[PDB]
């Protein structure tokens, strides 16, 4: 039996950060114990808006921290990025797709898509998304937010907002009625070990003001199944699976909000 | 004060 | 195959990072001779409630020393998480000595603290055997930096310190200590990561004898660490890195036993 | 506000 050149503690057994240890318990908490039926679980990157300065929130810590939902501590995310972040971001991941290429790693997958979005209303509101290229429904759903969780990230430009969804699917409106909103929609899309890497533009015009474009990120499970699965171990004493998980998407998300010019 | 699922 | 991640290379968590450039600085940008860097574990004691400070984060937090959070640390735990603490490093103590494990060191010390006055008042401290009353340190220790971190989810906090412990002359056998005291240290060191469970009795003329019950993690090897400190701010960082998340994760080892 | 060493 080999001596080792180095353990990493004392105990010679890996320990769970507690970051990780707390976002698996809101996982599986709306996996598992009250279960969401259609679930979405994504991650994008963004900012806390103070709602008494209209600037980043400020707090009096050095590192990433998740803050606690219990408190009101007057604040807001905006999901945005300016063009020249969003393109950043994007020859990042670009050499990480080609960098995964090579023998010996796992390779990325990659896409590109551009969708429409026709909002229609209700007695709420319902979302068809349309693929503008060969026009068929990609999606029609009744989307409901369940719950958040925000990351504030002193040392990094972003800040963090884990959401669970609710995306319940919904027969199309009938029948020619009107959308109530339109907007147009870029997608770059990557995939990492079922680890989906979004990267939006959001084009939406005015009848009176300029078009606004908006750039976003999202990192999102892609195995929602698999990940609930884990998450019914962890319930039941083998947490380990969920836990991994987790930190994958986690140091993915990590490596991301790092990204800056 | 802390949320239920933790 | 599994990747780490999309990169297939290790990361740096946000809080070694942090620590990490800590100890970068007063071991290489602006350096102490005598350098000692130890955690303790305490709790963190919010001035105005003088409770356990309360804060609306949900994971261990590093607080940023700019700030005045009206703040105070306290070093200490009862008796009965002492000898928890004191029954988990044992077993831990034992079972590094199997096959294939990098074994525990030991060592039980028994000391007086004296404390000596100065000329241009400030402080000198003389440690000594209870047994032989043999001189085991005579220093001048002075606190440098301090950093804190709030952890919601455990018994503890935590206080990385960085001291001046620099060695100075014997006093002379004339002059009186302004304070004595006994001390209890019983040291474990695992890969030159000093673990010390120490005891603290005071005597009083007037009031009951007090029992100060501590835990502190320390760096065994500076000179070494300096060296991985000085690679890091030449751009090989990684060693320190390596280092600096080891003394961390035996700490939040530590800080989570609790019964 | 951010201290010197970081």
Same mark, same amino acid.
């Given at each position: 039996?080999?001596?080792?050149?180095?353990?990493?503690?004392?105990?010679?057994?890996? !320990?769970?950060?507690?970051?990780?240890?707390?976002? /698996?318990?809101?996982?599986?908490?709306?996996? !598992?114990?009250?279960?969401?039926?259609?679930?979405? %679980?994504?991650?994008?990157?963004?900012? =806390? !808006?103070? =709602?008494?300065? #209209?600037?980043?929130?400020?707090? &009096?810590?050095?590192?990433?921290? !998740? @803050?606690?939902?219990?408190?009101? =501590?007057?604040?807001?995310?905006?999901?945005?990025?300016?063009?020249?972040?969003?393109?950043?971001?994007?020859?990042?991941?670009?050499?990480?797709?080609?960098?995964?290429?090579? &023998?010996?790693?796992? &390779?990325?997958?990659?896409?590109?898509?551009?969708?429409?979005?026709?909002?229609?209303?209700?007695?709420?509101?319902?979302?068809?998304?349309?693929?503008?290229?060969?026009?068929?429904?990609?999606?029609?759903?009744?989307?409901? *937010?369940?719950?958040?969780?925000?990351?504030?990230?002193?040392?990094?430009?972003?800040?963090? *907002?884990?959401? %669970?969804?609710?995306?319940?699917?919904? /027969?199309?409106? /009938?029948?020619?009625?009107?959308?109530?909103?339109? *907007? @147009?929609?870029?997608?770059?899309?990557?995939?990492? #070990?079922?680890?989906?890497?979004?990267?939006?533009?959001?084009?939406?015009?005015? &009848?009176?003001?300029?078009?606004?474009?908006? +750039?976003?990120?999202?990192?999102?499970?892609?195995?929602?199944?698999? =990940?609930?699965?884990?998450?019914?171990?962890?319930?039941?004493?083998?947490?380990?699976?969920?836990?991994?998980?987790?930190?994958?998407?986690?140091?993915?998300?990590? %490596?991301? *909000?790092?990204? +800056?010019? | 004060?802390?949320?239920?699922?933790?």
């Amino acid at each position: 039996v080999a001596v080792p050149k180095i353990e990493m503690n004392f105990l010679n057994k890996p !320990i769970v950060p507690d970051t990780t240890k707390v976002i /698996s318990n809101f996982l599986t908490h709306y996996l !598992i114990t009250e279960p969401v039926e259609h679930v979405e %679980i994504e991650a994008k990157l963004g900012t =806390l !808006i103070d =709602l008494e300065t #209209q600037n980043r929130f400020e707090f &009096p810590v050095m590192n990433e921290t !998740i @803050l606690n939902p219990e408190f009101n =501590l007057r604040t807001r995310f905006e999901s945005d990025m300016t063009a020249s972040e969003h393109k950043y971001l994007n020859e990042f991941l670009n050499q990480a797709f080609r960098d995964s290429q090579k &023998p010996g790693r796992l &390779p990325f997958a990659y896409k590109h898509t551009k969708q429409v979005d026709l909002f229609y209303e209700t007695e709420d509101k319902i979302r068809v998304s349309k693929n503008q290229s060969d026009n068929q429904v990609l999606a029609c759903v009744k989307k409901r *937010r369940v719950a958040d969780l925000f990351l504030y990230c002193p040392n990094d430009a972003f800040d963090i *907002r884990i959401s %669970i969804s609710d995306e319940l699917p919904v /027969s199309m409106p /009938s029948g020619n009625q009107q959308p109530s909103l339109t *907007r @147009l929609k870029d997608r770059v899309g990557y995939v990492h #070990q079922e680890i989906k890497i979004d990267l939006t533009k959001t084009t939406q015009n005015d &009848p009176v003001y300029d078009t606004t474009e908006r +750039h976003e990120l999202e990192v999102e499970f892609g195995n929602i199944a698999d =990940l609930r699965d884990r998450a019914q171990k962890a319930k039941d004493g083998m947490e380990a699976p969920l836990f991994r998980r987790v930190q994958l998407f986690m140091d993915n998300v990590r %490596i991301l *909000r790092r990204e +800056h010019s | 004060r802390t949320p239920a699922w933790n």
